[PDB]
DNA sequence: TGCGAAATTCCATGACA
DNA sequence: ATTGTCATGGAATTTCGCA
DNA sequence: TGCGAAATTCCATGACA
DNA sequence: ATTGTCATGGAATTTCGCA
């Protein structure tokens, strides 16, 4: 009001260009701009004006400004527009992100067999012999896979199947998602009794279990092909598929999961006979070098508009199972630690510490 | 001649009948002739049906070129012969009343029968749950001849469960008394 | 057999390199290759060998060849491998495509309002006043949107709502997907009585209705923001959202759907007053030029490995709702006509003519 | 002075009571003062409730600066005044017993009352279904003064339903006889 | 020392709820 | 406290057989 | 005739089941 | 017989105010 008073008489005020005639009409300070005559509201009224324009349809920066520009003008209008957008809780938790996640990590292949198991459940499937699910256990280094049919993705069925598997060898680490069968205290006690470290993916990020998930695709693809024209009796096919996939060549590796595990084919069709004249000690020596020379992919190029997490940054976790007409994003939270360019710890919306993937995060807009 | 390899020859035999443990009475023992690696499968009978059912689990992981056994009924049946022929497995039988395998296999089967006895006493009806840890012990036992464990010869790596502490494998004086009573 | 007979004595046969010693051992013709000694099977046995290797895990070109190469060798092995892959019905209908669709078309914006309506249903939503669905009608030229709550996505509810809409004007064409409400004979008769041409998207391709689908996103986004912290009573908000979105600026267009339809704002907040001194005839003249000068996007660049349809080509339509462990692709079919680089007519797997989008097609591999 | 524009002034009035057609008895007539564009909303009473309910549909498409009506009870109520104030609509009333609008609006309301009568005869209880086609006819009628139809002035385009054939708008001799009996 | 063709490698595409 | 993966088939590149 | 800053435009990202 | 669309906010580019 006092700022606008000195402007009407002709005195200069920073932000208001001098080459325009500021006059008074109908009790409102106006200005003759190239687009037309606009009302210059006092500083004390500009926040309320930006709010009324935004609240019409909760529009972003430009769509909110085009409304205000129809009637008003003042120095640095978008600055006041963005200020309100960053304070509108409804827009922050409902709008989508326009910044992609940084490029994925390609973690090193486990050095030895049984160094790390990946496990996951497939199902529910068509009922076969009373069974509905399949426990899939993939050795990270070899890709060798064990299949176990179960009636439920339960901890009890998981333990019974893994006790049979661990008859052959005990793994260092078992990696799984945060499903109910693997996060139960009963499963943790089972792993501790056997010296097995339990590793868990970040929530709602099956890419972290991409080792098994990819193997799940091959299992279903083969089961589909074998069941074409037949009723879906898959129970008796699980041993067939397990053997078939474990002895299938990976074209980029030039080896099968069986060969990476044993260094020699068994009495299967088209068994490789190259190491026939070598001794077992010479055969294992060649196997130890084959395992270390395997192809390993590198991190892909980052997309043109990606974001990487920074300690202290305001981020928002995606809502797991959002109800109809409910926001897709939680309220803003702060990054506590950056474990890797793709994984962070945040101060959760409940007050807890949470370890999440950036694929389920967006950086809070407008700072 | 070609050097001996894993999956060249599997030696199978039945151990039992045993005290009932969760309905099972026998143990089908499978030993790889080259590595000494041992698989233990509990069955309810020394029948061809139970043998095919247990070997179907094993042959879904690796298939041997030859299976060697004695002239047991479950192994000389026409059904088990048809089963082996479908998978390309050559059946090889020892002479009746003249059981013959190999020194490494003979000693391995000795260790299994002795290790089963040492843990049968005190818990005669709970050996079903113990079969996993029994296989781990057998397959991580240091071989004096080859100077490598069966696990190391089969996978070419060290194991996450090395068994440095050796059970006496002989029955202590108190275990002998609690066994003569059973 | 006769071909292999002349090879053992040293005579040359096309395809078999001369610089290798072909000998006989154990009743089989063998050859000393750099990788080792391989069996050369007779021509009459090579098809059966490729089949047994493929059928192990129904593997592609290289994984099937790596099996055969362990034991056998003959001239042009991959040629015989690919020949079997193109004949394996299970692989053709179960495998995924590795060729992306050609770039999308950006069809011209309708020249006038009411030239083309796009319609679609949103729902089911949380029950609000007994209503579960929303009929969304978007004018293609303006983006102006009408909202109608219904109890079901039915033809009867669609007709009752459109009879109210067509009180203001009758459209030339109504575009919709192939939902039950819009494909019923009752709806076709309703449109014919009013001189309205019914246009339908290709099946299972909501991109073709992208005009409404995109508007559906804005409707749900605004309804979500207005319902934050409140129970989802959306029935009384549909008129509010309809007015709010119809008067929202499109930042790339610099106009609202209301302005494109009427050429002048009504008594809404922040109404534009630029054309205040013009007459209505001068205002409509400016509106007629604004409609013709609107920004129109162009077709994006094709991806590096895209495919475009050709008449006579063997393509496969995607299965609509594939059951568990069932193939994702129909049996191969022939392209009859290419309506546009993104739409074709095929001889359907039942014998009918079908108009489909290439997004739901894959070119049959191995010709 | 500023030229007249659409949404500058809406003229509203009630027509009725009419024969019951699917439960409705009245028609709320809304005419835009500049274009002559007409909206017809069927109500069950000439009440503020039915007026607000029907104008909420219209004001979800466009909001007038001014609404003009007579001193009817539904329009002079404090409820309807609060409704108009919330939307920024200025209410403007004609003098009691002196109904005043504009020539274009007067003639437009004449056409509506006459067009409703011509189709009420023969089908007096089916006018609810006919309200859509009545609006199309009224809004696609050529204006002798402006030389443009209301549809053309509101949207700036020609219409897909041009009404070149004009109803007589007068009752034929047989329609007069079937009306004097009703 | 270089040619045509076969063999190998490359890698974008898509799917694991 | 954790992290994508890899079969697939045309295309691009290298290797082979021969001179 | 050019500077710093504001204003405008650009456009990759994601979601419409 | 048919076909993607567009709000969004950082970044890239243009324009503005002044000299
Ligand atoms: O969406 C899932 N996969 C789909 C999927 C998506 C991307 C990818 F790169 C790999 C994938 F597999 C998925 C789950 O969402 C899930 C949940 C949560 O519902 C609990 C337990 N297991 C789960 N598995 O196993 C899943 O695969
Ligand atoms: O998947 C649907 N949308 C999702 C969707 C995906 C991509 C896109 F670019 C736009 C989209 F909207 C979808 C349907 O699948 C659908 C079906 C088939 O179930 C019948 C009727 N309507 C339907 N509508 O409206 C849909 O949006
Ligand atoms: Mg899972
Ligand atoms: Mg999974
Ligand atoms: Mg739809
Ligand atoms: Mg839709
Ligand atoms: Zn907002
Ligand atoms: Zn196949």
Residue numbers in the entry:
A (entry chain A), C (entry chain A): 9 to 375
B (entry chain B), D (entry chain B): 116 to 297
Paper quotes:
INSTIs selectively block the strand transfer (ST) reaction, which is the second step catalyzed by the viral enzyme integrase (IN) (after 3′-processing). INSTIs specifically bind at the active site of IN when it is engaged with a viral DNA end. The generalized INSTI pharmacophore comprises two key elements: a metal chelating scaffold, optimized to bind a pair of Mg2+ ions in the IN active site, and a halobenzyl side chain, connected to the core by a flexible linker, which binds to viral DNA. Previous X-ray crystal structures of our INSTIs bound to the active site of the prototype foamy virus (PFV) IN in a complex with viral DNA (intasome) were instrumental in guiding our design and development of compounds that are broadly effective against IN mutants. However, recent cryo-EM structures of compounds 4c, 4d, and 4f bound to HIV-1 intasomes revealed crucial differences in the binding of these compounds to the IN active sites in PFV and HIV-1 intasomes.
Compound 5j, which has a hydroxymethyl group at the 5-position, represents a new group of naphthyridine-based INSTIs. Compounds 5j and 5′g are compact and lack the third pharmacophore ring and/or substituents at the 6-position, but both have modifications at 4- and/or 5-position. 5j has a hydroxyl group at the 4-position that could hydrogen bond with a water molecule that is consistently observed in that region (arrow). The hydroxymethyl group at the 5-position could partially displace a water molecule. This, in turn, could potentially allow the compound to make a hydrogen bond with the base of nucleotide dA21, as is observed in the PFV intasome-bound crystal structure. Interaction with the vDNA could explain the ability of this compound to broadly inhibit the resistant variants used in this study. In addition, the crystal structure of the PFV intasome with 5j bound showed two water molecules that form hydrogen bonds with the hydroxyl moieties at the 4- and 5-positions. Modeling suggests that the OH of the 5-hydroxmethyl moiety of 5j may interact with the adenine at the end of the viral DNA. Stacking interactions between the first ring of the central pharmacophore and the adenine base of dA21 should be strengthened by the hydrogen bonding interaction between the hydroxyl moiety and the N7 of adenine. Compound 5j was by far the most broadly effective of the new compounds we tested, suggesting that additional modifications to the 5-position of the naphthyridine scaffold should be explored.
